[model samples]
Target: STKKTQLQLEHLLLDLQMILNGINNYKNPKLTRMLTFKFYMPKKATELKHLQCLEEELKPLEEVLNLAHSKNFHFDPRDVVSNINVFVLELKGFMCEYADETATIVEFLNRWITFCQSIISTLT
Candidate 1:
């Protein structure tokens, strides 16, 4: 499950990077403004059991963003990019279903954190 979670997180990271790229090319500034909700949500309790897991997921995504900003991503998926918008939007919207209103931003991040006192490690 740990390895599977990593893969899913990587897939999400790649898909989101594609969206960020699309945002870069898109001239409309407010296009992404509506995407104010969280995106890196862990699907279930088992997937987000530990800090090591969350760190692993975040590091890969952080690396992708770093490469995208500082240099270049090198391997761009050109053929399917035309269809990536729907995929990106689907993930972005799918991310909103986690957490309750009583939960704060950290709890909204992943359900596993709220199960304990591990809400200190955070991000945007």
Candidate 2:
């Protein structure tokens, strides 16, 4: 990543804080326009704690993206399965969250999960 991405990253974090502070006044987040990772997640929480936890979680994700942005993707299949756990709900609580993704996207996501399970299947 260039200095430009570093600037964008800082700008994004600030924008995230602004939303956290704005509450009901916030709408149609511009931050959503920033690099939609277009995945899903698992979580349960209300405001303050969720906000703090999000900020904490965001750092590692941003760091990972920065690394990936700067270099070739050395994606580990096992590590990908072991550490990356996420869920998309039936009726989402966030406008930013995804639901009923394209058939191909759901298929692809399911394939990876099944592919990961194959390792254990081999032993069985």
Candidate 3:
């Protein structure tokens, strides 16, 4: 990849992480109340943790992008599936699960998926 490509990848990754943090840190009294229920709290808490974990996963990729910026790294379209598609799938699954909970989340995730697709296209 060229330096420009590496920089774009790094920027996209940071945007994704920012969105995840934005969602988790976003305050909604309704969401807070809904999460207070015994049945929903555990499930929602775990999902939130999953989102945070994905955010953590992006850091290594960021480091890789940094390294690749210094040294041109190669990427194969086929490899893109193994590396990124899984995360998109997981994010979509979470988004669908939360769809009924709030429109705000759906909106954020829609944008998030769009950015993920952007990265995928950039690589492929």
Candidate 4:
């Protein structure tokens, strides 16, 4: 017999909130958004392999961002927005890699966040 642990939705939500805060403060807004989006829209815990892949790809870019910031280089936020758009395009290509229902659930959650962000951004 196998014992299954109950899913803790509240814990996940809390973790997501903290992660989003970190993303918002990260020097590279593009990387930050990518990571936040990935975490918020994870289809399944077993599918963390994809997240690991994204994380690996981000490491070098993050290093570049850090170095630039340390050197007092000025950067435009639009650059980050551009990178985020590219990331979303790539991520959409992999959206169907998982089970259909699971993918839909993940997308739904991500869209909810996007909607909330849109409203908040508009207000500010």
Query: Cα deviation of 91 in candidate 1 (Å)?
Result: 12
What is the lDDT of every predicted structure here? 0.36, 0.31, 0.39, 0.35
Each model's TM-score, in the order given? 0.28, 0.23, 0.27, 0.25
Error of 3 at 58 (Å): 20
Tens-digit per-residue lDDT, 1-124, candidate 1: 4344444344544544454554355344433442343335444433233333333344333433332332344434342232333333332221223222333223333343242222222210
What residue pairs clash in candidate 1, if any at all?
A: none
Flag the better candidate by TM-score, 2 or 4. 4
Worst 10 residues of 3 by lDDT: 38-47
Please name the candidate that would achieve the greatest lDDT relative to the true structure.
Answer: 3
What are the clash counts of all predictions, listed in order?
0, 0, 0, 0
Query: Order of all candidates by lDDT, from best down to worst?
Result: 3, 1, 4, 2
Q: 99, model 1: CA deviation in Å?
A: 13
Q: Which scores better on TM-score, 3 or 4?
A: 3
Off by over 4 Å in 3: 32-124
lDDT by residue for model 4 (37-103), tens: 3322333433313433233333333443343343233343335424533433333233323323322
- Predicted structure 1, TM vs. truth: 0.28
For candidate 4, what is the lDDT?
A: 0.35
Per-residue alpha-carbon lDDT of candidate 3 for residues 1-124, written as tens digits (9 for 90 to 100): 3445545445445555544444355354544542332111011323212343334334343432332222232343234323543443344332312323323333434544555456546556
lDDT score, candidate 4, position 90: 39
